[PDB]
Amino acid sequence: APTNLEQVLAAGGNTVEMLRNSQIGAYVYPVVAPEFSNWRTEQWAWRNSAVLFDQTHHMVDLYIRGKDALKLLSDTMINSPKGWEPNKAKQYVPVTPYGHVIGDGIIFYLAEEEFVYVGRAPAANWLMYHAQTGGYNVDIVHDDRSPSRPMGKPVQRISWRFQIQGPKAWDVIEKLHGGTLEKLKFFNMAEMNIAGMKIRTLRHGMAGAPGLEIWGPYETQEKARNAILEAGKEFGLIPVGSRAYPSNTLESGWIPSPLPAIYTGDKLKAYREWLPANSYEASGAIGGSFVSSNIEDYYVNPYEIGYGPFVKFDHDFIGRDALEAIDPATQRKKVTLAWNGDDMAKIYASLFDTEADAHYKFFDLPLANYANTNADAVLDAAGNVVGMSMFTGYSYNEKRALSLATIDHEIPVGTELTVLWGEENGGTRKTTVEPHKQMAVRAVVSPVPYSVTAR
C-alpha cells in the first residue's frame, strides 16, 4: 500500500529499527566477475603493477542537459561553481537544508549545457527531485546501476566506464595512446587514443601514481577492454573483479556510504513523499554496532567525512546557512582505523570452535560490510562513543584489516581506540547477518589515505 518513503515511515515503526532489520540483503557490486585471477593478486597489482578497474555496473548515471543544468547543480552543491567550464569534473556533494550529507558523486562537465553524474543512488535521486519539482529547464536521462542478481538476463548501460591505475598505469596509457600523453591537473578531462577510437579521459590516480578514468558508448566496451588488456600485458596489468574492487577505497580513503540524511525534518517531507517505496532510501539497510533510536544520530555533515575543503560560500545553495553556522575546527574528522591483527585472528578463530555457544561476526574478505550503510561504534578507553566506523575490510597490500571512520577531532593519530564489531542481542534480522556475539576490536587511528602509523 505505501507508494513513497513518507508512507513507509508512517507505517513502519521506528525508522532506525526498520533500517537495521531491512530484508534487502547485501549491497552488491554487480555483473563484473567476482574474480579474474584472485582478489589478493588483484589488490597487489594496483599497488605494484597496473589494473583495469571495470566501473561500468555499480554506479547510477544521470545525464543532465539543458539551459538550467548548471544552475541545478549550483543550487544543490556545496562546491564552488565559479569558473567551472567544460572538461573539468567535480566531486558533487549535496547537503540538506539542515546541513547534512545526502550523498555524493562525480559530476562531469562534458560540454555547454551537458553534464553527467556518476555515483550511488542518493545524490542522483536528489538531483532528479529538484530537476522535476523545482522548475528547472533541464532534461534528465536516468541510467540505473545494473541489477544485483541478473541471473542470466542481459545487462545494458548507456556508457562503459573504466579506470587504469597503478604504478605502471601511465606506461600502459601511453602505449595505448601511441605516444606521450600529458598529465593534466586532477579531475581535468581530455582525450586519448585507444584502438583507433577517441576516448575521453579524466585525470585520476591512486597510491601516489597517476592514472585515468575513461568512458565511451556501451557498444565499444569490448573493443576498448581488449585493447587495454593486450597493451597492458607488457607491464603486468590485470583486470580487477568485483570482490577486490570496492576494497580499494579502504586504502584510498573515500567513504562511499553516508546515510542519506533525509528521514527527518519538515523541509524534507516533500522529498520523502517523492521518493518511491522501493527506493534506496526506503528499502536499504543499516548494519553495525552503533545503536540509537534517533535516526539523526546516523547523519554526517560534510566536514565530518572529509569534504570541508569543498565547501565554498560563493553561491546560493541548499543548506548554506546551516554550514555557515558550523564551526569547522570542532567537527569530527575522517581517519583510517588499523585493526589489531591479534583481534582479527580471534574473530576468525571463533568460526572453527566446535564447542563455543557463539562466534564473532563473520568478517568477509576483502570487504566485510553487510549493509549499504555501515555504522559501527568507535569507543575510547572509558567506553564513550567517540566516533562512527563506516566502511570495513582488509588490504592484502598492508596485511591489515582497516576501516574508514569519523572521530572526535581532538583524538591524536596513533591513539588506540576500539571498534565494536558485530550487533547486539545475537544480531539484527538482516539477511546478511548470522547469529553472533560482539567484539571490542582494538584499532589505531591512522591518516587518510591510509599510512602505517606507530601506536
Ligand X SMILES: COc1cc(C(=O)[O-])ccc1O
Binding residues: 29, 55, 58, 91, 118, 120, 163, 213, 245-248, 254
Binding mask 39-58 for a second copy (x = CB under 8 A): -xx--x------------x-
Question: Which CB atom, from 41 or from 87, has the smaller least distance to a second copy?
Answer: 41
CB 308, CB 99: distance < 8 Å: no
Q: Which residues in 55-74 contact ligand X (CB under 6 A)? A: 58
Question: Which CB atom, from 130 or from 161, has the smaller least distance to a second copy?
Answer: 161
Partner in contact with 158, chosen from ligand X, a second copy, none, beta carbon below 5 to 8 Å by kind: none
Binding mask 106-145 for ligand X (x = CB under 6 A): --------------x-------------------------
C-alpha–C-alpha distance, residues 109 and 315, integer Å: 18
Question: Which CB atom, from 56 or from 96, has the smaller least distance to a second copy?
Answer: 56
Question: Which CB atom, from 33 or from 158, has the smaller least distance to a second copy?
Answer: 33
C-alpha–C-alpha distance, residues 202 and 188, integer Å: 6
Binding mask 241-270 for ligand X (x = CB under 6 A): -----x-xx------xx-------------
C-alpha–C-alpha distance, residues 212 and 201, integer Å: 6
CB of 355 to a second copy, least distance (A): 9
Residue from 432, 441, 444, 445 touching a second copy (CB under 8 A): that is: 432
Question: Which CB atom, from 30 or from 276, has the smaller least distance to a second copy?
Answer: 30
The two beta strands, 385-395 and 159-165, are: unpaired
3-state secondary structure the chain: CCCEHHHHHHHCCCHHHHHHCCCCCCCCCCCCCCCCCCHHHHHHHHHHCEEEEECCCCCEEEEEECCCHHHHHHHHCCCCCCCCCCCEEEEECCECCCCCECCCEEEEEEECCEEEEEECHHHHHHHHHHHHHCCCCCEEEEECCCCCCCCCCCCCCCEEEEEEECCCHHHHHHHHHCCCCCCCCCCEEEEEEECCEEEEEEEEEECCEEEEEEEEEHHHHHHHHHHHHHHHHHHCEEEECCCCHHHHHHHHCCCCCCCCCCCCCHHHHHHHHHCECCCHHHHCCEECCCCCCCHHHHCCCHHHHCCHHHCCCCCCCCCHHHHHHCCHHHCCEEEEEEECHHHHHHHHHHHHCCCCCCCECCCCCCECCCCCEECEEEECCCCCEEEEEEEEEEECCCCEEEEEEEECCCCCCCCEEEEEECCCCCCCCCCCCCCCECEEEEEEEECCCCCCCCC
Q: Which residues in 131-190 contact a second copy (CB under 8 A)? A: 146, 148-156
Partner in contact with 37, chosen from ligand X, a second copy, none, beta carbon below 5 to 8 Å by kind: a second copy
CB of 27 to a second copy, least distance (A): 12
Asked if 451 touches a second copy (CB under 8 A), the answer is no
# of chain residues touching a second copy (CB under 8 A): 49
Q: Which residue has the cell 600523453?
A: 181
Cell of 140: 534528465
CB of 117 to a second copy, least distance (A): 22
Partner in contact with 256, chosen from a second copy, ligand X, none, beta carbon below 5 to 8 Å by kind: ligand X
Q: What amino acid occupies position 358?
A: A
Asked if 210 touches ligand X (CB under 6 A), the answer is no
Q: Which residues in 288-317 contact ligand X (CB under 6 A)? A: none
Partner in contact with 351, chosen from a second copy, ligand X, none, beta carbon below 5 to 8 Å by kind: a second copy
Cell of 444: 589505531
CB of 249 to ligand X, least distance (A): 4
Asked if 328 touches a second copy (CB under 8 A), the answer is no
Annotated binding site for substrate: 29, 58, 120, 245-248
Binding mask 169-208 for ligand X (x = CB under 6 A): ----------------------------------------
Binding site for a second copy (CB under 8 A): 25-26, 28, 31-38, 40-41, 44, 57, 146, 148-156, 341-342, 344-345, 348-349, 351-354, 359, 362, 365, 370, 394, 396, 398-401, 431-434
Binding site for ligand X (CB under 6 A): 58, 120, 246, 248-249, 256-257
